[PDB]
Amino acid sequence: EICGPGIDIRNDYQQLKRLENCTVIEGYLHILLISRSYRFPKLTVITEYLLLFRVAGLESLGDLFPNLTVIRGWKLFYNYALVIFEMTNLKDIGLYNLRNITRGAIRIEKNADLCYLSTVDWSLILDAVSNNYIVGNKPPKECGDLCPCEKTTINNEYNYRCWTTNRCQKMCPSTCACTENNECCHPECLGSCSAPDNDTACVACRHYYYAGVCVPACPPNTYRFEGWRCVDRDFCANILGFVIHDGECMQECPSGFIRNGSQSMYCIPCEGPCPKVCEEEKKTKTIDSVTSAQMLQGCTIFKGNLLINIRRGNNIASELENFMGLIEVVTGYVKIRHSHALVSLSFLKNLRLILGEEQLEGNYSFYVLDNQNLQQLWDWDHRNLTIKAGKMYFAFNPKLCVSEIYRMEEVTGTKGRQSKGDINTRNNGERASCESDVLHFTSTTTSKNRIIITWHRYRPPDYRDLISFTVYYKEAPFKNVTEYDSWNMVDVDLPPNKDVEPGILLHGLKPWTQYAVYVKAVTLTMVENDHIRGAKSEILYIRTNASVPSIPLDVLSASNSSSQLIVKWNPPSLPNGNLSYYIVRWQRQPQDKEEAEYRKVFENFLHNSIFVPRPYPFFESRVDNKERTVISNLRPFTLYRIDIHSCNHEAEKLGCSASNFVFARTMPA
Amino acid sequence: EICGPGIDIRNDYQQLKRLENCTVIEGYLHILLISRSYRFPKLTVITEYLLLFRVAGLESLGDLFPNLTVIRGWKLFYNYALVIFEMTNLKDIGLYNLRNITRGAIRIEKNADLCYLSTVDWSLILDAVSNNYIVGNKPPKECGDLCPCEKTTINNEYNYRCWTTNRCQKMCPSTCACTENNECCHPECLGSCSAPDNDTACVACRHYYYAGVCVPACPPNTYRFEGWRCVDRDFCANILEGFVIHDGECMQECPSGFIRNGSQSMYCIPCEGPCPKVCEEEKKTKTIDSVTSAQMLQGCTIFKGNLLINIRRGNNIASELENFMGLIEVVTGYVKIRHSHALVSLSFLKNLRLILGEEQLEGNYSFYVLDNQNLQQLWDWDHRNLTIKAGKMYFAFNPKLCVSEIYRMEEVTGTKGRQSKGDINTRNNGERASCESDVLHFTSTTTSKNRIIITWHRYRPPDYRDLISFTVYYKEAPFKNVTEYDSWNMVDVDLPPNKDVEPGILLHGLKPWTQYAVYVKAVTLTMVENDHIRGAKSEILYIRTNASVPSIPLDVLSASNSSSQLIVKWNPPSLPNGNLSYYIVRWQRQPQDEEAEYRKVFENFLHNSIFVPRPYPFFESRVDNKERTVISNLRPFTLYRIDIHSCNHEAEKLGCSASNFVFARTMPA
Amino acid sequence: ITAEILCSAHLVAALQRVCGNRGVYRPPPTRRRSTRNGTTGIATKCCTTTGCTTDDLEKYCN
Amino acid sequence: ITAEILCSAHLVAALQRVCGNRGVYRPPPTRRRSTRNGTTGIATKCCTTTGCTTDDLEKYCN
């Protein structure tokens, strides 16, 4: 009697009766929030995980499933094959017939009355014992773990092993998969044996199972179903359909595969991005949060309409780009309304086609409105776009330069399609700081803390305009930097001599740090022409030349054996470069703020008021990756000086760092 | 021989000869960057500070000014009266006649060869010895401070006191201002004495000096000049406009809040209002495109020019422009507010009551606003006055400002029928204004300690088809200056089904005695998208929860100055929750004897995947006003519990607050 | 009705108390593969510092 | 042109070298009123640099 593909019993105590006939549970098993005596000796195998949560009245698991032997864990609950959490009145894991857990780990937590936790050797029942989680249960010091048998080493201790107060923990001899008493099972068997080394006499089959036989691989005309048995071609033609692929019967073709026409039981390899159509029942999918956009994950074509209304949110540009970055074709229209968090639509990268099957009232396919922070669309000179039908409406977008949307309809192909009110400079580009020329940098020179950068001389559009410059620089960990936010600003004037070009020297910078620098021109127009131009430069990313790294931190050394010294340390405070390796040296030893700060401000007043303008040998080894190493071949009980250096990628020219040294003596012979 | 009003000797060593005749130096004295033997026994008094900096070759200050006795320091150099900085070859401060420095502190710094620093008791020469700064000189441990006399306590040590290796530090006896050897000077005298207790035999006068006499206050027909002598009326009639006589003092300019009297321009008359700065700028039209640009208009009363306000971006602007231009009252020319996208009101121009019109924009316009995207109101409310003498007014593309406001402006302005028909148009002005929106008149408010019930009148939308909903904006406001654009907690309550009940909302979880700003906005979803949309909104209602039991008194401290007495002090409660009336104190006799983080995220997944929704007696006294009281009649050396309560005006019905108690023991008998 | 912050047993107890006899749903159907889809449900929201309202408790519960 | 940020003692010495025979001195001696200060001092000019050009030092030099 197979039961599945998933059992979820909760609330009613009496609903547990659904397990009266089941000997194998295909899928998971859920017994939650349960508030008498029910015994199920029929059940022996569970393919997936087993979950127990807040079951009142149950004192031991043996009361329900005494014959449960194998939890295959074909699919896991958060990488766990058995979860016993917040189980009140539960005293012990009474699964004294449990033998093998095939895949997952165990999480037993918050069971204030649970005993016999350390009395179970989980190393012979499952494999990944390191990833188990047994925290928050009753304390073994306050329990009384008593046996009524065998024993082995548990952690560093050796003690008896019992499941409950009447049954021990059963184990196979070292000669073997065994039967009840000392006879090895079949190699393809698992758990116990009704008869020794027989395929048709196995409580549970390892690998796969078919027609009462524990087979390693499925017979030729059978396919993998779930993770324990094999089914024929006609069986998966009745599941609702499923595909046959790689000798396996899954629900849907895997990634990079699509169903073949007519012969819809097999997957044909599509080479390009397979047409991942996402079809939603709601006519217009409204994206009002990052959670709402989750349903669009991995979609290539969207049969519907997109309504973006994102007021608040988290780190959004990288998040939507995870879900919607693969969308390429939108059948309907796209509306970005009230999306104040969006500064750019760049998260819609692969979007190259917008059709217009349904259009907003007035035949609009692209409709943006009231986006206070939308600086730029995703329409830069790299991306392509095509709106087949519909018009474009732009309104109340103050940070959007109007020129940017004129560039849009060139690629869009709807230059003369919209009306005169569809694009209005009054509410679009309202507070714009764009519409400027391009200042070009000329040269950059980098040191460990100084940066010399110069830009080309800028002649203002008018002869009378007084010209000045402003340098914006700030430390940027990575390149996603906007000009509106941080920025340190220094005003440098145009040099008097026309042969020298304007520049600035920055002082006091962190070694090996990427700085974002851009220059803006200060054009004071005597004739206040409302055709304002201005000049602005590109965001230039400059990293300091790598300096000599800092000394390693907290050098500690010990001796676990004679002629051996173990040393550990921390990475230096200021790496000043990509860490490459550490150079350690050991030599035999012979036997016997405000003040300077306050001075700063006082100093400046002086100059600001005086001047006035006229009107044993060393052994050396390199540690490649870790911050720990062991020295070998030493004189026993002899003092050693331990010099440790820290280099980086450019330490080949700069030279490696200084030494943070320590002294340690080896173990006596 | 008086020399002034400031001596600045530098570069040339021989330029020091300018001190050959001076006995008193009126003002400061600079000896800078000097690279033989020059003696000036004439000099004795220095009014302002004395500065020495990088003088090479000088070994001691006694070589130049042996008779320097009093440095008045009327005006300080960075709060210093004497600055010895970077003096090379200088070995000691040879001012062995220095007696009194009246005002400032001392800063002697970076003199690697300077000795005799600790041998000088600056506590009897100056007053603010704590604010001195003697750092970076030759270390006393590495100098050799030796005397060739008297001594006293310096810091915690007692040691000899000498200026140089030949002269000691001279001091007056405890009986006295003394002469060379043990005879007290005159009370009005200072320093040394040519003869004992005589006015005409004093090296330096305390207070003031006139006609060879140390006088406390100036004679009736003399006035204070600088800070040491008195001069007559005709003297300050010759100093250079000229100097003023005010409060018996002869200063350079009238102090703040005073202006020069006409004709009699030697005295200051008290102007009551902001006295006229009268700001004249060379540029014809002053453009205020930033808060920095408006700085030049700080404190101006009348502006001879034109105002062009073009503020796109900015900081907190209303309070800043109000600081600069808030005092401007009269503008000779025209005023233009163009593109000023940050201005929501012109209230920063309060005292502006007159606009003349000397120069008018093309078309005879004196008041010209344009493209005021977020400007909702002028500064023209029924409180302010205004008069435009000549010119017209033009308003265009002014959406947020209501056209009725500018109609009300020309009533006070006096230009009702002067403008044309296109100067004030209703098309692009008031277009989407919400001032015209019908008020969601509140109906009732009910207040508790933490809950507020508030209801507003039912709102029938302008169209029959419009779907109507409400939104409640509430936030904690310490005071009333609250704008709708900022904070606000928003709750959407629907119109109730029954037409007899009016829409309301219940607020839960509010701080007792806290003023909340509440206003309701209507959500009118118009089926017919008529661009004649105004919406609906309500007035900002300030509601403070019913005065609740006050908070406990803060920081109850107690001590015992005597037996049978206990003094107790405390602070007012954190949340008074009403007007404080009195405190109730009670005294009772006491009888003699990552992991936890990682678990967090994993936890939420479990719940996020399991559950699924269906588809001795006490003595009591009252302290009336203060937060301090003294308990009397107590058992000596007996412990007492001190309960302190805090009541308010509504504590008669709601009860006095809880008790913040402390324990104290009285003094032993 | 406020967004109470309910966590650990208290979250379940809040669901247990709000539902009371209502409980939750336990029909066994045949299971399609990868029907586990669905994340960030209201149960997770209640535990968050923002919490979930009693109405939200009713929405996720029966 | 580009010049090293110069402060403290070195700054004074650098100025002396540049000024040489010219030196530095106040154009008006013994002016009745102080010209004031707090901005545009060579302390600010070279500690945070817009370019401590030789000509800029020359303007300071008198």
Residue numbers in the entry:
A (entry chain F): 1 to 35, 41 to 153, 162 to 189, 193 to 256, 265 to 509, 518 to 624, 683 to 705, 745 to 798
B (entry chain E): 1 to 35, 41 to 153, 162 to 189, 193 to 256, 264 to 509, 518 to 624, 684 to 705, 745 to 798
C (entry chain D), D (entry chain C): 1 to 62
Mind quoting what the paper says about this structure?
Lymphocystis disease virus-1 (LCDV-1) and several other Iridoviridae encode viral insulin/IGF-1 like peptides (VILPs) with high homology to human insulin and IGFs. Here we show that while single-chain (sc) and double-chain (dc) LCDV1-VILPs have very low affinity for the insulin receptor, scLCDV1-VILP has high affinity for IGF1R where it can antagonize human IGF-1 signaling, without altering insulin signaling. The binding of IGF-1 to the IGF-1 receptor (or insulin to IR) then leads to a conformational change that permits the receptor “legs” to come together, enabling transphosphorylation of the intracellular tyrosine kinase domains and activation of the receptor. Cryo-electron microscopy reveals that scLCDV1-VILP engages IGF1R in a unique manner, inducing changes in IGF1R conformation that led to separation, rather than juxtaposition, of the transmembrane segments and hence inactivation of the receptor.
To determine how LCDV1-VILP effects antagonism of hIGF1R, we performed cryo-electron microscopy (cryoEM) imaging of an IGF1R ectodomain construct IGF1Rzip prepared in the presence of a 30-fold stoichiometric ratio of scLCDV1-VILP (∼30-fold molar excess calculated per receptor αβ monomer). The initial reconstruction was readily interpretable, displaying a pseudo-two-fold symmetric arrangement of IGF1Rzip domains, with each L1-CR + αCT′ module engaging a scLCDV1-VILP moiety. Further ‘non-uniform’ refinement (NU-refinement) in cryoPARC (v3.2) led to a final map with improved resolution (GS-FSC 0.143 ca 4.6 Å), sufficient to permit unambiguous placement of the scLCDV1-VILP moieties and the domains of the receptor. Whereas the resolution varied significantly across the map (local resolution: min 2.4 Å, median 6.8 Å, 75th percentile 8.4 Å), highest resolution was achieved at one scLCDV-1 VILP binding site, permitting conservative morphing of an AlphaFold236 (AF2) model of scLCDV1-VILP to fit the density. Within our atomic model, the structural changes within each receptor monomer upon scLCDV1-VILP binding are seen to be considerably less marked than those induced by IGF-1 binding to the IGF-1R ectodomain. The L1 domain is displaced from its apo location adjacent to domain FnIII-2’ by only ∼13 Å, compared to ∼42 Å in the IGF-1 bound case. Also, although difficult to quantify due to heterogeneity in the relative disposition of domains FnIII-3 and FnIII-3′, the points of membrane entry are judged here to be approximately 90 Å apart, based on a linear extrapolation from domains FnIII-1 and FnIII-1′. Such separation is greater than that in the apo IGF1R ectodomain and likely incompatible with signaling activation. Instead, the scLCDV1-VILP bound to domain L1 makes a sparse contact with domain FnIII-1′ in the vicinity of residue His539′.
